[PDB]
Amino acid sequence: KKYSIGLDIGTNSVGWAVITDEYKVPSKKFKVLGNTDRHSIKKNLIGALLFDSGETAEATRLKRTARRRYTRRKNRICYLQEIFSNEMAKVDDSFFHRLEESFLVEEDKKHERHPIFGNIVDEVAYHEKYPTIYHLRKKLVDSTDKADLRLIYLALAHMIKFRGHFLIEGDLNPDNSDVDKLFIQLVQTYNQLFEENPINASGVDAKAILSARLSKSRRLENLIAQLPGEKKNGLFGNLIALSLGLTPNFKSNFDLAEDAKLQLSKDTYDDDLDNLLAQIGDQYADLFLAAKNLSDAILLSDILRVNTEITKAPLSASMIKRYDEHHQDLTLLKALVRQQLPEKYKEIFFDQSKNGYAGYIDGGASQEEFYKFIKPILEKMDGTEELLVKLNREDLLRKQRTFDNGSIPHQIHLGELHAILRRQEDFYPFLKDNREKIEKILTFRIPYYVGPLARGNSRFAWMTRKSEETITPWNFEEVVDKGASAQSFIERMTNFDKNLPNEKVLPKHSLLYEYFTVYNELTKVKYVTEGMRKPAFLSGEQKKAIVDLLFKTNRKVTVKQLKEDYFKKIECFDSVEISGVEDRFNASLGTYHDLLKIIKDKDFLDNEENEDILEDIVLTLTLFEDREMIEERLKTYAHLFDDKVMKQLKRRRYTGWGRLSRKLINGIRDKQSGKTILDFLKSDGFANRNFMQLIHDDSLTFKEDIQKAQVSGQGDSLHEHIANLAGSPAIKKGILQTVKVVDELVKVMGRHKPENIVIEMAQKNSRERMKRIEEGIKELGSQILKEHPVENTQLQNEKLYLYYLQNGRDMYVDQELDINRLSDYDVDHIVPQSFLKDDSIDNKVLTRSDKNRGKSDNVPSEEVVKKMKNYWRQLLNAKLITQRKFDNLTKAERGGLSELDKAGFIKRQLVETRQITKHVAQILDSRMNTKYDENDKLIREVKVITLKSKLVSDFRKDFQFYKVREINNYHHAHDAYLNAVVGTALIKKYPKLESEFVYGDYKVYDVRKMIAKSEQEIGKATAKYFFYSNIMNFFKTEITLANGEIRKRPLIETNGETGEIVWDKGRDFATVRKVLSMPQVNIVKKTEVQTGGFSKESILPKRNSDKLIARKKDWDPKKYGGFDSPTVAYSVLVVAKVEKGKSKKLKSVKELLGITIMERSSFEKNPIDFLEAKGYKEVKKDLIIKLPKYSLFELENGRKRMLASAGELQKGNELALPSKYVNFLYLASHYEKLKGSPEDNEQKQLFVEQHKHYLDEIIEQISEFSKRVILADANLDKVLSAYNKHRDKPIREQAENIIHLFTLTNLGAPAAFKYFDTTIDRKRYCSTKEVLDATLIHQSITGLYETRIDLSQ
DNA sequence: AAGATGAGACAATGGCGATTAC
RNA sequence: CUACUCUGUUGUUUUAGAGCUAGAAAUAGCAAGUUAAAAUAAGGCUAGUCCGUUAUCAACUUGAAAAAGUGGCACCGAGUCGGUGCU
DNA sequence: GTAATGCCATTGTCTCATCTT
């Protein structure tokens, strides 16, 4: 029995269906295991696996690095105590011991409750003498007297524990720290990036402006006032606003559609910066980097207020001044409030719940919340000067430990540490002996390229050891093989090219890469002069001349500079027109101009012998960021340069990686031509092929070379094949599940492999079209928006959007369209639906009658093209229409549609562009087909067909097999079935087109033979598959062309070459409808142990509740607080006995106990001991059942539940709504947006109106389903009541809201939903009792093989 | 008319506590 | 398009920073607050300045584990699958 | 006393209304 499998792979579901030769879904009897009376069940071979999305490893990575940081910080403190130990033992015996046990309460604390001195008197004296640690630090830096060793340790430990950032390398100096130098660097980067209309800031006094004590916005405005050519909303103004701490919007600066806001203080700035940079290119990356540096400088000046130089510790003195000012402002505030506003004093200083001062100090109230709370209070009170100016300047009652301290470099803390060590050096000899040791503890930082200092038991570590001793900050240089460690780092961090494995990818800023992309963008440029009247691609000599003369002289090349300074200057061409590019060249030779600015030797940059040297330099600067390792890897080229520019070269840094390798760009060579990819880009004769075309085109050896190396890089296991794929972990999980589903399906069919496996990979728009309309209108100059104003909400209508796209004019006739008579007007297709199924705006026009297109079934005639070509050219250059639409509109002037165009349409409909789909097909093909013959040829028994979603979607829309995702989860399985049907139909109808869809080595049939010329009526003497280029015409009974003639096709479609019936237009559509109507579809929720964090991360205060979880073994949460809300890994049905407490009373209980993630290892180590520790006795070990999340139970009347938890359930049933209601809902909800022909649209609308009683019937279906299964009668009553409340509303709205009503009945967790204004809150199933007497159903991945256990026992 | 800030609603399911009802 | 290394600042939690005056308390009037220690997934053995939140996971049999095995075919129907013949 | 009906969480984010430029 031959069969085929259809698959719909997604990130949260995998649809699957099995079809026969007559497009039927088999129904089979499957054995049922367990201990019930049901031994067989009938199931349809169609279903869908559902599963939670796979997660990325980012969060785990962050947590891991955080753990490492905490560990290493604690180790730093342990090092400091190790240095201090013997002399602290001589001074105080239990000092460090008291410091470690500071957290414990006095009952559990073995030593005195007072940490530092152990007696209350000395503690009071210390705190009064030093109320903050910065007081002690400033004293120890500015006092020559001998100090107590405990206080010295406190200062050093505070400076080491919170040591500051490492963003600045080397000693602190004005070149990389003062605001002025970084401002000059910012305007230098700005002028370098533009140079046309640059900003000159020679006169500015950046220090006096940026460091001045004023509000942020007023400082920004004051700096803008000093630059008359720039404004606050300019790019530079937005950069300064970003550097000062404001939230500037860069949307207007780059005309981006979506608003991109950046805030340096926000933790999510980097990925936001990566999104923005992705939109505008990485040329601005270093610009924003300089802004960040400038921000830190400004921040450092905001903290380093005490610049008077009378002290040696600027930071500690500044914190003292902040303390004093805080004290003054506090006492003044209390005085003013008590004087003027006696009432509400308690709300500010005692209440603490509403963000008062007590909330600012003792409650969870941030600085911005406290300021926001006290701003109106200060405004209302009198005598509040000198506090509001501080509040607006964000310097009122500041704490010493705030979010600003991230900007403090570690060289300052190092300075204060050096000062303290030097002051107390002679008094304590071991400080003199261990000065460099302590300094090394503060300054030592494990390099990125060394990584975890493991000894073989770390999956993430790679470093090499030159000894066998504990790595410390002092012996790191002589124990860590930095050379070998850096080499391993290189070997690990080098990703391999997806096109060619086993070859390292070049850096993104490599010179050869920039040359490659520059030529790749330049080769798609076409020029038309005055006389030739036809587009001609640039020749090799032209490319070399333009590159050498223009691209090697300026960073930005625009079309105007290109035509003015090359074509007119050298080629003497007065007027040129360019279609390939829009405004400028996206590619650029950034690295070239960077190196030119560094070494200032233009001839050296163009010598082809020095290419490898420059590639080595860029690679070294890309891989590493540390100055020492860069100097080590750049020492070989010290003699080449003058050693002045070498310093500037070492300061340059590059980040990023490309996607292609050197061997692909300029390595592999065509055997016949003898030219590499780059050589083909530079020279290719008349026609110039781009990169993607060389990969696609089979006439060259490049495609063969890329294909033949794909299987070398692969591995042996399935896991390695899945890990090598290029996709998110979610789709990789879905792919693995798909493979397993295929394995089970071929097992179910008696180990018979299928014949075919068909695979499918499962307000902004209004803004884009609005910006498009506004730019087109502003460019043209017709003020249609003035006489007929519209908003982005109304622009969703097709006919109105087309009305505004066409300047309010008819496309075929020279007359204006009537704004308020669009119902009489028709929407025409530039390329008819009989040739290509393209219903986008790119191929649609609006006109009063589609008879104006003319009599031909092709593109519009030449008589209309000749009349309207000028107006279409004005709409073209005004960006109202695209280049392709203009090409299609004016195709009759060039003969009309051609065989190459029809072949392009066929390839557009039949080939899948996504690489991930091809790799999945490769995996399935390799796993399914594994036989050979005597020779070395692969026998392909199973064909893996790759299909596009558009085909099945159009199949649904054309024949009313409508999809409504909100009804149930059946649509995945249905999509898989329809994929199988369409795939099998296409492989049966057109076997010679196997190379388009089927994976593997096939004959590359040129499509020119297949396309029939001059309507040969698909003759049989010659092949002639089709005259009309639409592949899905044979499913249709009639074919309506663009003129109105209705062509007829036979009732039974058969293959021409083999005489096999491929589609019976009666029996097969009836079969498809019957399959779509089946109510039993196997929907399976993949059961999964829950993993991840133990609980909510919140560390809650102490409470009298046994739900609290201890943060450490001996930290009783009733005294110390802790975590609550643990996640249940899985539930465990246990049959056991418990003590009632009134007596022994071993009542035999049966209940689900949730094993939390934290408890899992202990429970699995020894379950019985764990359960006895929980209180259970005489546990029936053999009856314990492991129940992971989504475990399925069936109760009475087919009602089903899924396990969400140990104490909560989810809905387990699917609502098999009849097909007629699904189609009615789709039609009623899509009333205005039918997007079909007018007659067809009228038919659908009349069908909806004639069948409006289906609304009440659907409500009845939801009601009866809910009463049987859902059991939420309060919500059902709410629903029915709301439906009766809104029966007056239009049919469309009632349909749209019934769609929301199906959330009441959906499989999975209950969720709230809205019926018009009314909201129905979720009813949860917060009890697991009933499942203890239900039937548990263990399911295979396909759900076919079941095991039913009656838990009554 | 555009940009920024504040408030009311959405994500999105399960655990905790309170509540209420038998 | 994933994956990875180095690093910081906040935050939270207990304890320390003596509260003072009345009053049998309850509760009232005021003073004060900015800082610090320690933990920051419980923990693990392999004892490293390492690892612990990703991937993977129905049931049953054999195994410490990677992993191997276990479930008849047609026909008439179709409310979550039912019925009939052969085997 | 036991068993079935709103807030919080890595407290993010999006849209609408009002005020300011």
Residue numbers in the entry: 3 to 764, 774 to 1364
Original paper wording:
The basis for Cas9’s utility is its DNA recognition mechanism, which involves base-pairing of one DNA strand with 20 nucleotides of the guide RNA to form an R-loop. The guide RNA’s recognition sequence, or “spacer,” can be chosen to match a desired DNA target, enabling programmable site-specific DNA selection and cutting. The search process that Cas9 uses to comb through the genome and locate rare target sites requires local unwinding to expose DNA nucleotides for RNA hybridization, but it does not rely on an external energy source such as ATP hydrolysis. The described linear- and bent-DNA conformations present a new model for Cas9 function in which open-protein Cas9:sgRNA first associates with the PAM on linear DNA, then engages a switch to the closed-protein state to bend the DNA and expose its PAM-adjacent nucleobases for interrogation.
Remarkably, in the other state, Cas9’s two lobes pinch the DNA into a V shape whose helical arms meet at the site of R-loop initiation, employing a bending mode that underwinds the DNA duplex. In the “bent-DNA” Cas9 interrogation complex, the protein grips the PAM as in the linear-DNA complex. The CCR (candidate complementarity region), on the other hand, is tilted at a 50° angle to the PAM-containing helix and leans against the REC lobe, which has risen into the same “closed” position as in the Cas9:sgRNA crystal structure. Compared to the high-resolution cryo-EM density contributed by the PAM-containing duplex, CCR density is poorly resolved, reflecting conformational heterogeneity; however, even at low resolution, its distinct helical shape enabled construction of an atomic model that adheres to B-form DNA constraints between the PAM-distal tip and position +3 of the CCR. Underwinding is accomplished through major groove compression, as observed for other protein-induced bends. At the distorted bending vertex, a missing wedge of cryo-EM density appears across from non-target-strand nucleotides Ade(+1) and Ade(+2), suggesting that target-strand nucleotides Thy(+1) and Thy(+2) have become unpaired from their partners. The overall weakness of density for Thy(+1) and Thy(+2) suggests dramatic mobility, and the modeled conformation of those nucleotides represents a physically plausible member of a diverse conformational ensemble (which also agrees with solution experiments to be discussed shortly). Therefore, in the bent-DNA conformation, two helical arms join at an underwound hinge whose target-strand nucleotides are heterogeneously positioned. Remarkably, the “phosphate lock loop” (Lys1107-Ser1109), which was proposed to support R-loop nucleation by tugging on the target-strand phosphate between the PAM and nucleotide +113, is disordered in the linear-DNA structure but stably bound to the target strand in the bent-DNA structure, highlighting this contact as a potential energetic compensator for the base unstacking penalty.
